[PDB]
Each structure stands twice: as C-alpha cells, then as structure tokens.
Amino acid sequence: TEKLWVTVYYGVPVWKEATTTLFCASDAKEVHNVWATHACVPTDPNPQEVVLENVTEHFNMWKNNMVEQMQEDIISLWDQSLKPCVKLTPLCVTLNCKDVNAGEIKNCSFNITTSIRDEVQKEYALFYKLDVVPIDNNNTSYRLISCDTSVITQACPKISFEPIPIHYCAPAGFAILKCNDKTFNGKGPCKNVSTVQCTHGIRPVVSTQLLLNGSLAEEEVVIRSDNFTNNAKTIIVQLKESVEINCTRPNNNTRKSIHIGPGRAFYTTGEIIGDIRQAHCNISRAKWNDTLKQIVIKLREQFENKTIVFNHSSGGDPEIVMHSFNCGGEFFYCNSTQLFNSTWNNNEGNTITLPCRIKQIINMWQEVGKAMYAPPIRGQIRCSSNITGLLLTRDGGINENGTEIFRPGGGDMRDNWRSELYKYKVVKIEPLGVAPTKAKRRVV
Amino acid sequence: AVGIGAVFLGFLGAAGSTMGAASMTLTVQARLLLSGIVQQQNNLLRAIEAQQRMLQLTVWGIKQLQARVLAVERYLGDQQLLGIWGCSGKLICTTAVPWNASWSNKSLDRIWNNMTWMEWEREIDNYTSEIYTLIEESQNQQEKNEQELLELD
Amino acid sequence: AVGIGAVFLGFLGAAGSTMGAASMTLTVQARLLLSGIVQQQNNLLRAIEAQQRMLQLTVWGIKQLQARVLAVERYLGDQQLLGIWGCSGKLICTTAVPWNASWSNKSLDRIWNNMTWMEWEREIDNYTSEIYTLIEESQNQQEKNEQ
C-alpha cells in the first residue's frame, strides 16, 4: 500500500524555546541570613549533564529570559529582606557637624527624640562627606542625601551581604540547554550542545563597570557584543585569566548603638582607634598592562587595527562613574582613572593605588526613594578579589580617523548577569509527535 | 448513637498479612490514594469547602493548596509510570522482563508464604530504579516497535 | 569519590538521531516529564520538601505553586488528548487517517533513515492543527462504526 497512514508517537524528543520560571537552588545553605536562604531550595550540590551528538541550536545571549529572571528576582528578594527592618525617620533631623581632625569625614551631633519625652542632642556620628548635603552658604548644618524620598531603611544588623554560589534548574517539563563550545560568540548557532540539570555556580555580585569573581575564558580573551556596528550598546569583555586585586581598609573603628525607639536601634560609628587611614585598592600595574594588552589585541580584531584609546569615565555622579565595590558588607566607590588612561598603537610604580570612597546611604539599582543605610562593620576590612572582565562602551562621538575610543561601560545590572548566563537556554519539551508510516489502525 | 457493622477489609488491612493473601487487597489501597474525607458525610465536605473559601486569602489556605497539589502530584507520579509501561491499570500486570536473580534468589515458597510487603521491599530498595528502566525498555523495544511491524503488510 | 558506569541512555540523548533510531528511548524521554528530581535523590528531595514547609512567604512562594500546577495541567492536557484519540497506552498509536500528501511527500525512506524529529517538526508545523482535527474525526466515526 503506497498510501501511508498516520501514526502518533508519544515521547518524542523535541523542544521549543519558551518563557518560564526556574527553580532556584541556593547551594550549601544562626547562619545567616542571605542569600536566598528563605526563597530558594537549601542545597543542590551535584549537577548532571548529557551530551548530545549530531545536533545544533541557535543561541542569543542578548534576548535571554534568564537574565530578566535574576534582574527581577534579585531586586525582589533583597527588597523583601528589608521589609521588617528599621526605618530611620527621626534621623532626618537637621544635623550639625565638624570635620574630623587629621578634606574629611565629619563628627556630627544632632537632636533626637527617644526613650520617653525630650531628646538627646550631643552625639558622635561619624559620617562620610558623600552621605550628607550642606545647606545654607557655609553653615555646618545639614541633612542626609535625599531624605525627601525616604532613603532610610537600615539594613538589619544580622543580615549579611555576602554573595554565595547559587544554581538555577528547570521545573518539570522544561530543560536547560547549554552550548559546549569554546570561543562561543554569545550570538549565533552552536554545533556542540549538551543539556544540564542545573547551571554552574553563579555568583550574584553587585558591582559596576567591573566584572568580579566570574567565570574565565579558556584560550584567549574574548569580546562579545550584540552589534559592534551599534556604538550605543555595551560590550562585554571576558578575561582568559583573572587579575587579582586587593582592596583595603579605613581607620579601625568601633560601632556605637543608639536607641531611637521602642526597640528601634540605630547603628553608627562613633570611635576611631588609631590613625585615620585611606581606603583604597591595590593592583599590579604590570599585570593590568599585560591583560589589557590581551584585550587590545581583540579590540583591533574588531576594526581592522585602529589605535585603541581608554579614557576614564565621562564624569558626573560618583555613584554612576566610579566603580562600585562590595567587600565585608560595606560599599566602596573607587576611582578607576589609572586603569583607563592609555593609548595603544603599533608599538611609574609597581602597583596602582586606587582611592575609594566609603558610603553608607546606598541607592540600590537607581530605585526611586528606596535607598538603604548600611550599618558599619567593626574593625577593618581586608578583602581581595579577582577581576574577571570588563564592561566597555565605544564612544558614539568619534570623529578622529584611525582610532577607536572606549570608556568604562554602562547600563543596568542585566549585563552583569549576562557575564555568567551566556550559554544557557530554557526550552519546553513537546512530547507529542505525528508521522506517516505504512500501517493502518485495524478495526476491532 | 451509632452502631457498627463489620469488615469489609479496611485501609492498610493487609499491612502485616502474608503477601500471598495481601495481594488480593489491592482495591482498598488504590481506592484511597486521594482521600481521608470519604463519603459525603455530609457536613465535613461543607466545612472543608467553607474553609477552602474563607481562608483563600491567607497562609493557612495556601498551605491547604500546597497539600492538595502535593497529593495530586504523588498520584500522577505513579499513574505516569503505569501509563508508560504496558500496565494501564489493572491492579496488576506482567512484563516480558525475566527476573534477574542478582536482585534476589529467594524461593517463591518463602516469598509468597512468609514475608510481608515491607520485608520484601527492604530487599529490593536498591534495585528499584534498575528494574523500572528494564521494564521500560522492554515495553518499547519490540513490544511496541515490532508490534507496529506486526501490523505491517 | 564517585565512579561512573554505562548507558542506559539518559534524558534527550536521542536528539542526535535520526528518527529511525529515535523510536527507541521513547520511555526515557517521557518518564521525566513530571520530575527534574526523579528518584529519592537523597540530599535533594529532603530539601525539596523542606522548602515547601517554608511557604509562609507571599508572591515568591506562590509562584512555585503556579509552576507546579501548570506542570500538572500541561501533563494532563496531553493525557486528555490521547484519551480522545484512543491512545490511552501508550508510546505508539496508529490511527486510521491516511496521510495527505499535501502535507508532505518526501520519501518514507528519507523520513525514517535521514531525518530528525526536530526537522520533522519544522516541516509540518503549519498543518498540525487540521491533522489533529482529522484524527478526532476518525475516532468519532469509529465510536459509531464500531457499534
């Protein structure tokens, strides 16, 4: 019988890309009390992987759902954890202060109503210059950044900030597909894929203009972009090996507790032990030059061989143009100019000192009025990390021929998550399939 | 007041029964993999529906949703397997897979005459997954492919 | 210290085939439709249930319920469709609808020996709709004809 008959097959290995929500597993988690220790499966340490043979698939990092996940999810969860914490409304009282004895941080005093009736005026609040806003000519009286938009949520003393390895996996009916290929562009077809039960460890580090503690490239430094032609989009540079950087510590200090309400506690810094020290980071100058060179090579690969220029940030708000940095649960904003002050063409110290500012009022993700207050950490904070990549932007106003100009990049944090999620897809399984064959469903 | 009749076996009635006889109570177990509020009552259903409604706005209602969904998943977790195998229920069924003695050599006269289901179960815990997979491939391999070909003229 | 044995081909390994070979492992594929944590999975499942004890959270927690319910519903949707078609069990089920060459006329040999399910999907995607309808009519007429 030349005429073929329809036969239904069930359990047919096919898939379609589709939007869904993944199941977070906060691997390897008084504890306490972050990351998603209360919004994500406690532990899932052992990933599974199945290699596929003669298959191909098209990947597109720049439109990948999983980023939107983390972008919402992280904000959501971080926000959540602060709901039951103290709102420092009394603190908005007009402060009066004085530079601390050797420009400088200041030793402030202020009236505040607490306990019963009346108030206690004489205080020892050591605030950093970039947390306050001077009012009225040269008077020493003023108030915190933008109290007009609340910005007073004190992060619970018990809540840590430490970024921990988290994994994502797919719910029943979905599968995570990964491109098993070195040099993968981040955009286009992959000729060697495999499925995974979960992703590899992700490290949710909030930082800007600088990719820290991520995954490394294997052969040679790589540069990814949605559209190199389009000068308005940020490019992502992933190092072939990391560059270690050690960031330092302020004056040693003691945290003071201030009673502000019926159990409401406000923490600040009141006592300095020993000399006043400048917080900064140190990095090998030579090593930076080494890997910078590596990058430059590939930048040249992207436009013939035009000379490469690195200019520091265009200028503006420190919280935008300096590189933010997490360490010890405190927030640094450091000047990066020394790292982006070079030109490269056809052809000093040992390390670089990068001065940092230490802030306490932090506006996370440029939210409107939802800024927080970071309580101070007793003692000094020593931390060191590994630079694993860069976020760069090509200057749209390049009018000099023979050169290509870059500045520290920009955009939101979505790009920051891309640095890990650039090889994963989430697809839905479609069990039912139908194909012709030479057999008829017999009656009776 | 309330007076009482008689079994009518009963839930888990065969739990300690010798497997040979316990094998004939499968109807009781299967009947209740979705329950504990059986029969109208008919005030219990009324109450449960009332709490399912009233508590729809709060955590305790959510915990009931959680439990209910769990029940369904567990049910379907077994139905899926029974569907995949050529054993749509039917309380029992046989396969083409030969018993591999590596799993257990024990004599059937010991099994069916002096052992509970739980004792028996202890002995095959580590071979469960293997056994399933072998049933699965036996189901597909030939019993379905060749079957298709047996209607091929 | 963990050692590795043999296959026993796992989840989606069949994608490399070749529909002729893809008739195998249909169970391997199907069996995992309701779980990404198949098996007791000591030191996983325990945490999976522990997490569901922690559903005093709102918004976030409830999203997981949505996920679970949709998984169940997705499964059941397919089960109903197969029931309608008279394919209650299981893997392979032939119909009495003759293949319309309009949909495709590639050699049978091409299909099974040198074509992959993913491709097949792409090729006859636009006809899926009416194919299903026709299958329903078959079973409908069979309900009455078998009387």
Partner: antibody, heavy 135, light 113 residues
Framework: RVQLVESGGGVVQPGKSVRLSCVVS????????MYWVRQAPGKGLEWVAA????????VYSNSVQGRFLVSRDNVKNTLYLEMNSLKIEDTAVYRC????????????????????????????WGQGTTVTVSS | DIVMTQTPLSLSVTPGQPASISCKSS???????????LYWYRQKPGQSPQLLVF???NRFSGVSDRFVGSGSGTDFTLRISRVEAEDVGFYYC?????????FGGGTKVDLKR
C-alpha cells in the same frame, strides 16, 4: 578480621612486569570495594588504585595510569595488582587495603542514565610487600 | 585534584598535655550525600596505618576516647585530649571527596625532652 595477606614481592629490574596478590580471610568481598596504596621509601603515602566491590569500575592514579592493572576474583576471594613497565620511581612497599563502609550495588540515575558507584575511606590494611626496582 | 597540607611536621607533646593537628584543604570536602569526606589516620614506625576518625568529629570504633575531631569548611582539625606518651607516631589527613585520594603533610608526634 578480615585478615589481609599480601605476597609476590621482591626486587626486579626496570622495564619488567610483576604481579602482586592479595588474599583476605573471613571476608564477604562482594559488598566491598578495595584499595591499593603505596608507601614509598621516600616516606610518604600514595593512593595507587581503586576497584569496585563487584570489579566493574576501576580507577588508577595518574602516575600509574596506563601501567598498572587491577583485577579481582570474588570466588577465590583474591585481588590482583599487576604492574607493567616498571620504572625506578615505582620502588615502594605496596599495601592492599579494604574500605571502611559497606558498598551497596551501583545506583542507576534515571535523569542522566549513568550508573553510579560510591566509594569511601578505608579501615583495614595488610602489611603489603616490598617491591623494589633496579639492579 | 584536591590537595592539602598539615601543621608543621614536628609536634612535641608531654604526657597529660592535650595537643592538636589541623589540616588545610584546597577545597571544602562537602560530599553529595550531605556529609564531609574527611578521614584521619596514624601509624607508628614499623606499624601499618590505623584509622582514627572517619567523619569530622566522629572517631572510629575501637579508637581511644582521647581523640576528638573538629573543624569545618575548608580547614579541619583533630585534637587529642590528654595526650599519652604512647600516642607518638605519624599522623595523616586524608580526603575522599574525589580522585585521586590524597594525603596531607604526614606529621609526626613525639615527646618533649
């Protein structure tokens, strides 16, 4: 005991091949994977090789990879470690030992389809035998 | 490969004086079944290897009560309470999370004189 007995040692020249044998008294075997280790005259301990309880999975140390051969006979209750192409560095006292926990049968993972084995530390050693190399 | 080291090789003790040996690992030994894959061993000159503890803070049956394991994360320890003069000998840390199975420094306890 679980009494471990080893023999077949001595001194041999480089490039030769040997066999070491290990017999254990009063011991199930089928439920227990076994180890071979190396105590060097250079005063250190090295793991050399491991073999599953049912002799279906064997792992070698990187230094002996492609040189040594572990095998089993669970009916005769005996382990064998042969050694091909001996090099001078291999001069050492080799010790036959047994694992600490019991091992169950390999567990088949239904998601990946891989048949996994689980290993562990060890609790009983013999005294092994000295095997030296050169002239 | 997982590698690791122990305290400096020569540890002198006295009868009745407790003493401890740590073991620093290159990677946390968390195992997939929810436990930590760390073992301690010892042996005397002319004496085959003996098992001291088999889990972190869980000594092995037959081993004296003096032996108290502890520690966590990436760096663990073994403390012997009330060290006896007969506790001298070589001490080894051993990891079993992955292959190859490796050993620590191989320290040795001896007496003060």
């Amino acid at each position: 005991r679980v009494q471990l007995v080893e023999s077949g040692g001595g001194v041999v020249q480089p490039g030769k091949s040997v066999r070491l044998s290990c017999v254990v008294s009063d011991f199930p075997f089928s439920k227990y994977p076994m180890y071979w280790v190396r105590q060097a005259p250079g005063k250190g301990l090295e793991w050399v090789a491991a073999i599953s309880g049912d002799a279906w999975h064997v792992v070698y140390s990187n230094s002996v990879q492609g040189r040594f051969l572990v095998s089993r006979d669970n009916v005769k209750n005996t382990l064998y470690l042969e050694m091909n192409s001996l090099k001078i560095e291999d001069t050492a006292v080799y010790r036959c030992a047994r694992m600490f926990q019991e091992s169950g049968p390999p567990r088949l993972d239904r998601w990946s389809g891989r048949n996994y084995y689980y290993y562990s530390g060890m609790d009983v050693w013999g005294q092994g035998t000295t095997v030296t190399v050169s002239s | 490969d997982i590698v690791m080291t122990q305290t400096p090789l020569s540890l002198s003790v006295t009868p009745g004086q407790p003493a401890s040996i740590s073991c620093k690992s290159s990677e946390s030994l968390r195992q997939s079944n929810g436990k930590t894959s760390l073992y301690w061993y010892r042996q005397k000159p002319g004496q085959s290897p003996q098992l001291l503890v088999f889990e972190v803070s869980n000594r092995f049956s037959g081993v004296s009560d003096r032996f108290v394991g502890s520690g966590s994360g990436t760096d663990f320890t073994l403390r012997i309470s009330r060290v006896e003069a007969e506790d001298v000998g070589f001490y080894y840390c051993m990891q079993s999370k992955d292959f190859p199975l490796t050993f620590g420094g191989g320290t040795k306890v001896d007496l003060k004189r």
